[PDB]
C-alpha cells in the first residue's frame, strides 16, 4: 500500500535531515508507486509523499 | 360556466375536515385530563396515549396530502384549521421537527398559490399572518406579500367583533418574549384594523377595554383613533377593582388623557383596598406627582394654585398614612416613593418610615454580604442621604451598614 512506502520514505528523509548519493534511495520508492495504490490511498499518505517530494527536489540534479 | 375557486373562510369539505375533528378531539381530551388534574400518574398514561394518537394521525395526514393532490381541491376553512393545529400542536410540544417543517412548507405553498388566484379575503390575511408570525415561521415571499397586503386600510372596515378580540388576545399574550424581527409586522397588523376598533369602541365589554389598551400599549403604539376608548374608561371608573384602577392610571397617563379631575376621582378606588399592594402605591404616587406638575402657578389661572396644591397634598397624606401595610419588592420602588414624598413635601408617619427603612436594610443586606448578585453607587448615595435628612433613628444600623458598604466599594457605578 501507500502508507508503508510513505512512512519508509519519511524515515529516510528524516535520517537525511540529521548524504552522498543517499538521495537515490527513497527516490526509487517515489518511482515505485503504481496507479492502483494511488486510487485508494488516504490523504495522510498523500501529504507525506508531497512533503518528501519537495524535500528531495530541493537538491535533485535535474528535473523534479 | 366560468370556473371559480372561491370558498368562504368561516359549505363543502374533504377528509381534512375529519382529520381536524380527530385532532380537536385529541386536544380537547388533553385539556380534559388537565381538568382531571385540577392525580398525576393516573393521567400520564392517557397523556402518552393522546400523544401517540396525535403523532400517528399527523403522519397519516401529511402522507395523504403529500402523495395525492388534495391541497388544490381543499377548501379555505380546512386550510385555516390545519394551520392552526400545525402551530398549536408544536407550541405544546407534541410534534417532531421534520414533520412540522414539511407541513408548514406545504401549507405555505398552497397559501401562496391561493393568493396568486386572488381568492384570499381580508379576514384570511389577518388570520394567516397572526397565526404565522406568532409561531415564528420565516417564509420570505409570504411575509413580504402579507406586509404589502396590510397597507390597504379600506378593505379592513368589515371585520367581525369576535375576530378583533381573538386576534388581539393572540398577539398580546405572546409579547413577553417575542423575537425582534417579528415586532414590526405585529404593529402593521394592529394598524391595518385599528379603525374598526375605533368605531366599535362603544360595544366592547368593560375588561376588554383595558385588555385592548394594554395590547396596544405593549407594542409601543398609541394611535389617536383609539382615543375615545380611554375617555370611556374615565367615565365608567366606578366598576373596576383597585388593581385594574391602578393599571388604568398608567394607561391613561400614556394616553395623554391624564388630567387633574380624572386622577382626583381615580385615587378613591385605590384607597378602598383593605390591603395595599406596591403597584397601587407606586401608581398613586406617580399620578399625584404628575398632577402636581399639571397645575400652573405662572399661568392664566394663578388664583387657585396653592388651594389645589394643598388638596393634592391632602390626598397624598391620606394615602401615605397607610403605607406600612405593603411589601416593597425592590429598592427602586422605595426610591420612587421617597422621591415623590420629598419633592412634594408630604408628611409621613414615623411608623411607615420605620417599616420602609427596615425593609430596605434587610433587602440591601443580601447584595453586600453575598459580594455579588444589583445596587448602583448612586442609589446608595440617595438612600444614605434620605436617612441622614430624616434621621439616624430610623435604622441606627443601616447607617454604618451603608457607610461600610461604600467603604468596601461593593456597589459599582451605573455606567460601569
Amino acid at each position: 500500500t501507500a502508507l508503508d512506502v510513505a512512512m519508509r520514505v519519511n524515515k529516510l528523509k528524516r535520517l537525511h535531515q540529521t548524504k552522498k548519493q543517499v538521495e537515490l534511495d527513497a527516490w526509487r520508492d517515489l518511482n515505485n508507486l503504481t496507479e492502483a495504490q494511488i486510487n485508494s490511498a488516504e490523504g495522510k499518505a498523500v501529504s507525506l509523499l508531497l512533503n518528501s517530494w519537495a524535500y528531495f527536489a530541493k537538491y535533485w540534479e535535474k528535473g523534479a | 360556466p366560468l370556473p371559480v375557486s372561491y370558498s368562504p373562510g368561516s359549505v363543502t369539505s374533504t377528509a381534512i375536515t375529519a382529520h381536524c375533528d380527530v385532532l380537536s378531539e385529541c386536544v380537547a381530551k388533553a385539556d380534559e385530563l388537565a381538568v382531571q388534574l385540577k392525580t398525576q400518574e393516573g393521567m400520564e398514561e392517557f397523556v402518552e396515549e393522546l400523544k401517540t394518537s396525535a403523532t400517528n394521525e399527523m403522519t397519516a395526514l401529511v402522507k395523504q396530502m403529500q402523495t395525492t393532490p388534495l391541497l388544490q381541491r381543499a377548501g379555505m376553512h380546512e386550510l385555516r384549521r390545519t394551520l392552526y393545529y400545525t402551530t398549536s400542536l408544536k407550541e405544546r410540544d407534541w410534534l417532531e421537527e421534520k414533520q412540522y417543517t414539511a407541513a408548514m412548507r406545504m401549507l405555505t405553498v398552497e397559501v401562496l398559490r391561493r393568493d396568486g388566484d386572488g381568492v384570499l379575503s381580508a379576514d384570511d390575511v389577518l388570520y394567516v399572518t397572526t397565526h404565522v408570525v406568532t409561531a415564528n415561521f420565516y417564509n420570505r415571499h409570504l411575509w413580504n406579500r402579507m406586509e404589502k397586503s396590510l397597507l390597504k386600510f379600506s378593505n379592513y372596515e368589515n371585520i367581525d367583533m369576535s375576530s378583533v378580540k381573538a386576534f388581539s388576545t393572540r398577539l398580546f399574550k405572546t409579547r413577553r418574549g417575542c423575537a425582534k424581527e417579528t415586532l414590526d409586522i405585529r404593529r402593521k397588523v394592529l394598524l391595518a384594523m385599528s379603525r374598526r376598533v375605533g368605531v366599535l369602541a362603544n360595544d366592547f365589554d368593560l375588561p376588554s377595554l383595558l385588555g385592548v389598551l394594554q395590547c396596544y400599549t405593549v407594542h409601543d403604539l398609541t394611535p389617536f383613533h383609539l382615543e375615545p376608548l380611554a375617555i370611556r374608561a374615565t367615565n365608567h371608573v366606578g366598576d373596576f377593582t383597585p388593581h385594574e384602577c391602578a393599571t388604568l392610571a398608567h394607561v391613561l397617563r400614556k394616553w395623554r388623557t391624564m388630567r387633574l379631575e380624572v386622577c382626583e376621582r381615580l385615587v378613591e378606588r385605590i384607597c378602598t383596598s383593605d390591603q395595599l399592594t406596591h403597584h397601587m402605591a407606586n401608581a398613586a404616587m406617580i399620578a399625584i406627582r404628575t398632577c402636581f406638575n399639571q397645575v400652573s402657578d405662572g399661568g392664566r389661572n394663578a388664583m387657585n394654585a396653592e388651594p389645589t396644591r394643598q388638596k393634592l397634598r391632602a390626598m397624598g397624606e391620606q394615602i401615605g398614612c397607610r403605607l406600612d401595610e405593603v411589601e416593597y419588592p425592590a429598592l427602586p420602588v422605595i426610591l420612587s416613593i421617597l422621591d415623590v414624598v420629598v419633592t412634594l413635601k408630604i408628611y409621613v408617619p414615623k411608623k411607615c418610615l420605620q417599616v420602609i427603612f427596615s425593609q430596605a436594610n434587610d433587602m440591601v443586606a443580601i447584595v453586600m454580604e453575598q459580594k455579588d448578585d444589583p445596587i448602583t453607587a448612586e442609589e446608595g448615595r440617595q438612600l444614605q442621604a434620605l436617612l441622614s435628612h430624616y434621621g439616624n433613628d430610623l435604622a441606627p444600623e443601616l447607617s454604618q451598614r451603608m457607610k461600610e458598604a461604600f467603604r468596601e466599594g461593593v456597589l459599582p457605578d451605573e455606567a460601569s
Partner: protein, 453 residues
C-alpha cells in the same frame, strides 16, 4: 490601483454624492458598480464608519441582499451593535430601507429600540439625520417619534436650525403620518422668525409638506397664501406645479392666488413638460375648479410632447381630461397608441383608472383594448372592491368575453363582495355589467345580485 478599504469607502461616498445631487452621469454609476462588485472586507480590519459607508453606497447602487459585500457588512452590523454609535445609526438605517430580509429587519429593529433611549442626549444634526433616515424606511414606532418630537420642540426654543433643517424635518415628519399640531406649530414659528433667510427654493417644499400632512387650520394656511404672493414672479414651472398641488391639498379656494398663478403659468407654457401638465391637471381635478383657456394650452402642449409620457403621466392626464370634458381626438389616439406599448408599466391604480376613463369617453381603440385587457390577470390580486368594479365595467364596455381574462376578476369580486355590493356610487354601474354578461356566466354572483343584500 489597489488601495485599502477605507480609501475605497471614501471614494464610494463621493461617487454616491456626485450621482445623487450633481448630475446623473451613467459612466460614474457603471464605474462604481464595477469597483464595488469585486471588493470584499473580510481580510482587512476597519471601524464601523468605513463598513457602514461601504454598505450604504453598495445598497444605493442596486445591490440586493444576495451579493457578498452586503452580507459581509450585515453580519458585522449584526455582531457589533455596541460599536454603532449615534453617528453611524442613520447611515445603516438608511442602508437597510430597501432590503427586506430577516437580518435587515432585525438590524432595523435593533436601531429603533436603541434610538428611543438616547432621545434626550442628541443635538441638531443628529436629530435631523436620524428622523430623516427613520422616515425613509417605513417603521411604525410611535414612541420613538414622540421622544424625538419632544426633543425637537425643546431645541426649537433656542433658535439654531437653518432652512434646510426645517425642510428636512417637515418632509420626514409629513411622510410618516404624524399629526401632532404643536410640533408643526413650533416648526412654523421658527420658520416665520427667520427673516430673509427662507429663499423660494427652500420655501416651496416646506409649503408642500405642510399641505401634505393634513392638519386642519385656515389661519396659517392664509398666512402661507399671503407669503407666497410676493414670489409669484420668481419660480419656474416645477415650483408652480408644486404650488398648485399643495394648494389643492389645502382645499381652500384662494381665488386671488389661483388667478395670479394662472397668469404666471400661462407665460411659462413652453417650459412645461408632461410631468408638470399631469400634475397641474390632477391638482385642478382634485380641487374642483374649471379654467378652460389654460386647459386648451396645456392640452395642445401635451399633444406636442406625447412621446415623453410615463404610466403615471397617462393615468393622470387621461383621468383629468375625461373628468373635465375637454376632448381631443388626435391627442387621445396618440395617448392610447403610446399606452399600448407601455401596457406592462401600469401599477394597480393606473391600469384601472386608465381603462375606466377610456370606457367612459367612448374612445375604444382595439390595440389598447387587448393590451390592457390581457394585463388584468397579473394584477387582479392587488386591486380593491371599487377598483375591481370599475375595471369590470370598463371590460364589459370593451366587449372581450374571454374566460382567460375574466376568470380571476370574478373570483376577486366574490372575494370583496360585501364592499362590492355596498357602494352607492356605482349601484347603477353593476347593471350594465350584468346586462352584458347575463345569468349564464356566474351563478353565484347572479344569485347574490338578485338577493336583497
Amino acid at each position: 490601483s489597489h488601495l485599502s478599504a477605507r480609501n475605497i469607502a471614501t471614494e464610494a461616498l463621493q461617487m454616491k454624492k456626485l450621482h445623487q445631487e450633481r448630475g446623473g452621469n451613467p459612466m460614474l454609476a457603471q464605474q462604481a458598480r464595477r469597483v464595488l462588485f469585486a471588493t470584499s472586507i473580510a481580510g482587512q480590519n476597519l471601524d464601523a464608519r468605513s463598513v457602514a459607508l461601504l454598505l450604504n453606497t453598495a445598497v444605493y447602487f442596486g445591490m440586493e441582499s444576495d451579493a457578498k459585500l452586503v452580507r459581509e457588512c450585515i453580519d458585522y452590523c449584526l455582531k457589533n451593535d455596541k460599536l454603532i454609535t449615534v453617528d453611524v445609526l442613520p447611515i445603516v438605517v438608511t442602508a437597510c430601507a430597501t432590503l427586506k430580509s430577516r437580518d435587515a429587519r432585525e438590524v432595523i429593529e435593533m436601531q429603533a429600540q436603541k434610538a428611543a433611549r438616547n432621545a434626550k442626549f442628541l443635538d441638531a444634526k443628529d436629530v435631523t439625520n436620524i428622523i430623516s433616515a427613520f422616515s425613509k424606511t417605513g417603521i411604525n414606532h410611535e414612541k420613538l417619534f414622540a421622544f424625538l418630537s419632544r426633543r425637537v420642540q425643546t431645541l426649537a426654543r433656542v433658535g439654531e436650525f437653518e432652512a434646510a433643517h426645517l425642510v428636512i424635518l417637515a418632509n420626514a415628519f409629513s411622510r410618516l403620518r404624524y399629526r401632532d399640531k404643536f410640533l408643526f406649530g413650533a416648526i412654523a414659528r421658527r420658520a416665520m422668525s427667520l427673516r430673509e433667510r427662507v429663499t423660494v427654493n427652500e420655501l416651496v417644499p416646506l409649503i408642500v409638506a405642510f399641505s401634505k400632512i393634513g392638519l386642519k387650520d385656515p389661519k396659517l394656511s392664509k398666512r402661507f397664501a399671503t407669503k407666497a404672493m410676493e414670489y409669484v414672479d420668481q419660480m419656474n414651472a416645477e415650483q408652480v406645479a408644486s404650488m398648485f398641488m399643495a394648494f389643492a391639498y389645502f382645499g381652500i379656494r384662494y381665488d386671488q392666488l389661483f388667478g395670479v398663478l394662472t397668469n404666471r403659468a400661462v407665460e411659462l407654457i413652453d417650459e412645461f413638460n408632461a410631468q408638470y401638465i399631469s400634475t397641474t391637471l390632477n391638482a385642478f381635478q382634485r380641487i374642483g375648479i374649471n379654467n378652460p383657456e389654460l386647459f386648451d394650452n396645456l392640452a395642445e402642449r401635451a399633444l406636442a410632447v406625447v412621446q415623453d409620457h410615463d404610466a403615471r403621466d397617462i393615468s393622470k392626464t387621461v383621468t383629468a381630461l375625461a373628468h373635465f370634458g375637454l376632448k381631443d381626438e388626435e391627442l387621445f389616439k396618440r395617448l392610447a397608441s403610446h399606452a399600448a406599448s407601455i401596457a406592462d408599466q401600469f401599477d394597480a391604480m393606473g391600469l384601472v383608472n386608465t381603462a375606466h376613463a377610456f370606457a367612459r369617453t367612448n374612445f375604444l381603440q382595439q390595440d389598447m383594448a387587448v393590451a390592457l385587457s390581457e394585463r388584468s390577470v397579473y394584477v387582479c390580486r392587488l386591486l380593491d372592491a371599487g377598483e375591481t368594479r370599475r375595471l369590470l365595467w370598463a371590460l364589459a364596455k370593451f366587449q372581450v368575453r374571454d374566460p382567460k381574462i375574466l376568470t380571476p376578476v370574478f373570483n376577486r369580486c366574490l372575494a370583496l363582495h360585501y364592499d362590492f355590493f355596498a357602494d352607492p356610487t356605482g349601484s347603477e354601474e353593476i347593471e350594465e355589467i350584468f346586462d352584458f354578461y347575463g345569468p349564464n356566466f356566474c351563478p353565484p354572483l347572479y344569485q347574490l345580485y338578485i338577493s336583497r343584500g
